Each structure stands twice: as C-alpha cells, then as structure tokens.
Amino acid sequence: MNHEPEVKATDMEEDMIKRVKEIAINAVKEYKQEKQIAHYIKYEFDKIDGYGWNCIVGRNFGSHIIHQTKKYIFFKINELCLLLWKA
Amino acid sequence: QQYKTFMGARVLWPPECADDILEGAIRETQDALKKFEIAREGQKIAEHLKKYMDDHFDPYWHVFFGKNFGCQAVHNKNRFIYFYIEKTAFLMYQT
Amino acid sequence: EEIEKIVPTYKIGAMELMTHNICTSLSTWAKEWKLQYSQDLHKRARQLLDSLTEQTKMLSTKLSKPVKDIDSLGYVMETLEQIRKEQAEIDMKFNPVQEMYSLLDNYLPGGITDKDEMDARSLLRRNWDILIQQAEIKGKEYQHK
Amino acid sequence: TDKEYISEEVQKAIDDSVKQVFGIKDDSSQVTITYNKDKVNLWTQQIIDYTIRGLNKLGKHFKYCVTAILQQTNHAGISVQITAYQDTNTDGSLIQCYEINDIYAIVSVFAMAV
Amino acid sequence: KEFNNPINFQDTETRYGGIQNQVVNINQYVQRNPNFIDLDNIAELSEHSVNTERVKTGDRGMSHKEGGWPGNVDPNEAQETGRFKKRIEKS
Amino acid sequence: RKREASLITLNYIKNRFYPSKIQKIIKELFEDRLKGVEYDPNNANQLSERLVLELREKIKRGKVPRYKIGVQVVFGEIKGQGLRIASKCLWDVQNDNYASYTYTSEKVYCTGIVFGCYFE
Amino acid sequence: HANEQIIDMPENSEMKSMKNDAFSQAKFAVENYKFENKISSHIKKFFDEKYGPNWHCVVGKHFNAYVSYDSKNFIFFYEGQLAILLYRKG
Amino acid sequence: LTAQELNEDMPSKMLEPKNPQAPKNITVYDYYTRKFKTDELVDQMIVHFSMDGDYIWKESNEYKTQEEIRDTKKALIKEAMRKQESEEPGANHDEEAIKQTLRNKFNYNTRECQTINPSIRERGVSTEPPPSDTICGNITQWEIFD
Amino acid sequence: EPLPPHIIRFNDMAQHLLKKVIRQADVLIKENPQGLEKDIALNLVKFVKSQPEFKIGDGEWQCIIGKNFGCSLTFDANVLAFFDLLPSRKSILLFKSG
C-alpha cells in the first residue's frame, strides 16, 4: 500500500496542493521509471498552469532553484522526494 | 543454471556482466587466491577484491564468496558476476 | 554486561573467593560513570533545544512587528529569506536533536525536567509548523503590503 | 539453387518494411509524417522488427544484421560506409538510402552463411 | 563429417552509403525558445538470484545382522544356503 | 567434465571476449584518425571511407580470426540535429556478439558499429 | 547459538520497528521456506515493502563477505544454525 | 525465427532475433505497488548513438506552442514597459532593465531543498561454522553389559 | 589549462562555458568534501551568475546536485549543462528555465 504524501517545503494555494498530490499518486502507479514519473507530472501541469514548468524525482539530491511565487511545491512520498516549480 | 569453464574458472555461462569486467575480475581473484588462502584469513581477500573493483570499475561493488550460501540481489545492467573455482563460489554485483 | 555476566564466586585447589562483595561495589561506580557521560550529553542536548526554541522565537518576533514603515519591510524581508534557508538546513539539523534527546531518555534514570521540557519540545515542533503556516499567510499579506 | 543470397530479394524486403511503416507509395505524397523526437524512438524499433520479419519470411539459413540510421531533415553532411570480412562466393551485404519527405533514413543489411 | 574450417575466409568488399543534397532554407526554424529534456542519473537495475549447488542427500537403511555369504546366494532364503553348504561338501 | 567436452562438439564457439576488447581497439584507432575535430568538408567523405578499411583489418589483428567480421562506420555533421542510430542482428544467442563505440566532438560525431558472427 | 552478532541499526527515533522486524521475519522465513535463496527473496521483499527499496540480503551456512552499506541500516544475526545478513545501499 | 540443423547429427541449435548483450530482465521498484517489479520481456534492440536535438519545422504543432510562450512573455514585458512608461513622466527605461525590473523578491522567491542521505560505510563479516571433531567408538556385547 | 575528471551525460552548451563550470564545480566540492549538496549548489549558482559574459538571458541560473535523481525540465536553447565528476561520483545539473 502507498499512503498519501507529506509536503515538506511548499508555496501552493489550498485548491492547488490537492491537485498536486492528486497528479502525484496517478503518476507513481502509471510509470515505474524515475524519469518517466517526472515527465508525466510536467506535461499534465502544462495544461493547468501555463507552458512553463519543471519537475525532478530524486531518492537522494539537493538544490536551490528560482521559482514563481505561489508556484512551488516539494512533497516527499514514502522514501522518494519530488521537487516541482515554475520558470 | 547451466555453468561453463572459461579462464580456469566455473562461471554461469550467460555472462550477466560485460565480458571485459568479468575477465579482469576472475583473473584478479585467481591472482589474489594464489597469495592469500580462503581457509585461513578469508575476510582479508574479500576486502582486497572489493577495493580493486572500485579502482578499475564503477564504485559500490558488493562481494560475497562462500562454500555454501544462497542470495537474491538487485544489481545494475551488466554488473553481476557469479563464478565457482575448485569448490568455492564467488558472487559480486555493482550498485 | 561484564558486571551482569561476572561470575559470583571462583575457586582454586584449596581456596574460594567471594566476588559479589567487590563486584556489587563496581556496578554502582561504573553506573556513576555512564551517569556522568549522560550528564555531559544532557547539558549539550539541552543547549541545542534552547538554541532551536530561541531561533524559532527570534523569527516569530519579526512577524509579530507591525512593519508599517518602509525601512521596517527591508529588515524583516531578509528574515523570510532566512526562514526559508532555516527551513532547508533545520530539517537536517533537527534529525540529530530528535535522536540525541531519545538516546538520552533510554540511558538516564532521570525523567528530563519533569514534564516542563517534554511540553517545551512538543510546543517547539508545533511552533515550527505554525511558523511555516504564518510565513505563507505573511507572504500574501506582504504582496498586499 | 534453393538456398543462396540475392541482391534483388533483400532490397524488396527493405522496400516492404519502409512501406509497412509509412509508404502507401503510388507516386504521390499521400501521407506526410515530419520527424518528432518522440516518434523517432518508436519508428526505429518498428522498422527494424518489420525488416527482420520481412527477411525471415523468404529467409534461408543466413544470419541477418540490420542497422537503422534516421536523419532529421538532412542539411548535414552524413556519409555511411560498410565493409564485410566475408568470402565473396559465400555472402554479400547491401545498404539502401530512402528520401521520405521530412525524415531521411538509411538501412543496412549484412548477410552471413550458416 | 562434423564442422571444420579449412576453407580460406579472407575476401572483403565495401559499399558507400550517402544521402542526396537539398535546399539551404529547408523551411524550418532552428531551436525552440524553451527545450524539454528528461535526464535520468540512475542506472536500470535487474535482479538475479544465485544459490550454491547443495550436494544431493540420499537416505538408505541396510542391516548387517546376517553373516557374510556370497552375492548369488541369499542369507534369509533357506534353500539358497542349504544348496551352497551341499556344494562345499563334494575335498 | 564430459558435458563440457560434449559442449565443444555441438558448437566449438571459440568465444573470444568480443565486446569491450574490440570497443577498446576501435576507440584507440578512431581518436588518432579523426585528427582535426573541426574538419567535416565534402572532400573528407572520401577520407572517412579510408578510415573504415583500416578499421576492419585491426579487428582481424585483435584476436578474432574464426569469427566473420562486418563493420559499418557513420561520419556526420551535428547542428543540434536529432537522429538515433539503432541496430538489431539475427544470430546465435551467447555464440555471437556486437561491439559499438561513439565519439562526439564539438562540431562532429563518428559512430563505429562492428558485427562478428562465428562460422565453421 | 548466536554468540556474536553485529547490530548497526538506528534504534533511536522509533526505528526499532526496522531492527525487531529483522529478528522476527528471519525466524518465520527460515522454518517455513527451508531454502537459502528463497529466504533472501522473502526477508528482502518484506524490508522493501515497509522501509522503501534498495535492500540487499544474503543467507548462507558458511560464507565470507565485505560490502558497502548505508550507515544505521546493516544488521548481522544468526537465526538458529543459519547466518542471515541484510543491509541498505542506495 | 528459424532453426539450423548441424551436419552429422550434432545437437540442433537456432538463431533468435534477440540481442544477447542486452540484459535478461529489467526491474524498477514501484512505490504504488510498494514492492520490486520484474519485467522478463525487454526491448532487446541495441542503439549505437542516440541524439535528441532542438530542430523544428515551420507550422509544426510544437512551434505554435513555442510562439504562444514568446507572445505571453512579450505581453507581460509590453504591459510592464507601458505601465512603467505611463506611471513615470517620459520614462527612459530600456526593455532589458524592465525584465530585470519585472523579476522581484515578492514575484520570484528562491528556495533551497535537499533530501537526508545516509553516509555510505564499508564493513566485513566472515561466518565460519562450528568446529567438527572426529570421534571413534567401538561397542562389544561385554562393554554394553559391563 | 587542466580540466578535472568528469562524465558528460548531456551537454547542450558551448564548450568555453562548460569547461569554466566544471573547473569551479571540482574546486567547490574539494573545498567542503562530505558537505551537503545544497551548500555546493548555492555557491555554484552564485559563481556562474557573478561571472560576466556567462549570461545567455531568458530564465535565471538554477543548479541541482545529487547522487540519485531523474527529472524533466524546460530550459533555454544551448544553456543546460549536465556532468558527473569521477572522483566525487556526484551528478551536477545547471540550466536556465523561462
């Protein structure tokens, strides 16, 4: 079984964060590969939140990235860490 | 399951690992075992081999040889080497 | 475990020795030792929480300020950026403190500052979660400001 | 001569495969499928399977190596060259270059006796 | 008979692949303001189980309460013994 | 080892470690003959052929004899031009192999695929 | 009778669930399956389910082994006669 | 998918499309499934040189999208330029400065995020079974009775 | 001019720019070894931003450093530099997204 994620660092609207964890559970079951997961997230988020978008899916990594305000969200599912942002 | 004899060693014939990494690997164990014996000081020769793999090939090799054991492990594409020599069976896989 | 397993009496050809008599004394003295190392830790562990209770307080004060004046915004703007950096670094810095205070509990027959500190540790983690929520609300208030 | 290698037969096999993937033929560009980065990866796996299956059908006791080179809308000096260390009166190899609208594709076929 | 290579195997022929030169414009626009690339760092994994060949363990139960006879003669059977005694007394 | 002595009868094989040994041999040759990475005119196509002839002989030298060698070289200009060179050969599993190496310069790319098939 | 083990598991921050399930599974896995390979398939599959993937475990009566692991995920215990080894890496 | 008969009743073999160098299976842990998932079937197709390159043709589907992105960025710059030119008297702000002027501290925050990675560690474990001692016993009828 | 050991996965960037990033990246990991990936990421983005005639415009420089990560990003034409340093064995992703 796969329980719902937990948002560590986040800047999303009460409506949006639901749509992100939504797309997150759909993506993880559909695609096995770590790059294929990311590839789905972005292309779905290109329909809802305009052309420009980016997504990473790392078991162990770190960064600082420049993101549009209210268009950043980092959620860690059980032993996997997904970082997505805008522009 | 079908084994085969190449470079004086009894390996699983469908060579999971690439045939260069396998040849250099078996040859180093045979040249390690010509020095240190498995019966006496058997921990040392594993640690010698483990470090050798990290030098010449990609890092984080796991090394497992015994007269009797049974393992199911996840490894990278073409990074799994399992060969018998006399009676002792040598397993190792890159991560 | 050496004082656990220590033999209570050994013997030779024509003599018995009673070890318990000595052995019993060594338990209460090598305990005093671990009690010391646990009270070299206890003071270390408590100085981190204090640093982590303040740091979280120090950031909450900048939010508590009205910040009506121009020059005031420029001060507490750098602190929201500080909050973020903390948010990244702190989730790393936290993991040691959570285990440090645990490990202690198992090794100290003391019940750490009654319940006053247990409450202060649970309040800290709540105060951090409130701060993140407050920083999101402040971010919106900031855009209108 | 039941077995033996023939120039014409191989060429016919590759034509059928290139047609099977996206060639109604008939002397008019009835279709037009410009080269996507997504579709390229699929086409290669499709073409190569179809070519082999094509060679398989009429196949004798010849081993068959086939390489698929695609090219994004030419404009770039590419030159393919093939050499086979193999007895003459035994086997021959062939390459055939196709000019299919936007996509450009070269197919090679090695023949080896068994 | 079986499979041997005495026949010369040396000869080599080449062929020359190419494509036909076209127009410079090509009616295509170089690059995209943005570009979309999906970079993995992880290496595709595959699991293989290997177990050391356990030597086969037969189980057999034989009594030696009987004395040492020949093979052809049965120690239980009275006939087999009775004849073999009569064969010794024939010197 | 009667099954092993048997195994030699059905197929002699002579499985000379084909993959990386050749991959190392072709790599060493390519670097030297590429010379100027910048050079990709129309008069170097004829010179890119000469490379391919030399290549196949050094495959014979590198402990192959009994195998049957077929090599295909591709020399092309890159201008962010998206192309994929795949291959798939019908052969005897674990009885034959392939060797591939690709060298990418700033302005030029050269890929060398080498096919070897056992024959008796 | 498991005289000398090596326990390098987290223990602190209620991760004893991930050490105790090493001793607990081992006992249930060994008695039922009774095949060295199939043990290493059962214990691994469980520890992947609960604590996420990239666990490697190797079960043998007599073996040598040197290996790289993730600090505070490696435990080496004797279940009866048999000698089970499991650890994370990646 | 054919078979070679070998001369003088040798063991039959054959020749399969599948490339041997390619891995046998490929296993990629699912988080939804929550257990490792093996795929015996593989793509078993070798690629020497793969190259994905930015290069689009006039009137694609992918171009139209690229144009919309330019037109949105342009519109935001145009508005931001015009509004700064309308608010200020005879504004001499260059189009490059106006973009840098569009990216704010409260219109593009810049967060750092890493994951907690355990430090790698290399350990040795040698398992040697109990010593096995030879014993020699004889039993006779008298020694039993004695 | 020496260049430290590295493996290119994908380089959609000019050679002059890439070489200048790798040198810094090697020196920057060598400064704080067994140091956190975000600490190395932060200082690397500062360098590439700070250096003049390194800017290709559009987005803003943003660097991701890890040992294990897949991804899919939209970046500016000829501005993305992926590489993995052989002695460290840590991948480095650096690009501008508009």
Author numbering:
A (entry chain M): 1 to 87
B (entry chain J): 16 to 110
C (entry chain A): 1060 to 1204
D (entry chain N): 4 to 117
E (entry chain E): 12 to 101, 104
F (entry chain O): 13 to 132
G (entry chain K): 4 to 93
H (entry chain D): 61 to 206
According to the publication:
Thousands of outer-arm dyneins (OADs) are arrayed in the axoneme to drive a rhythmic ciliary beat. Each OAD is divided into two regions, a head that contains AAA+ rings (rings) for ATP hydrolysis and a tail that holds together the whole complex. The tail is permanently attached to the MTD A-tubule, while the head region of each HC contains a microtubule-binding domain (MTBD), which binds and releases the MTD B-tubule depending on the nucleotide states.
To further understand why microtubule binding is critical for the TTH interactions, we performed cryo-EM on free OADs. In the absence of MTD, most free OADs are too flexible to support a stable interaction between OADs. However, there exists a notable preparallel conformation, in which the motor domains are stacked next to each other. We obtained a free OAD structure in that state at resolutions of 5–12 Å for different regions. This transiently adopted preparallel conformation is different from the fully parallel structure of arrayed OAD.
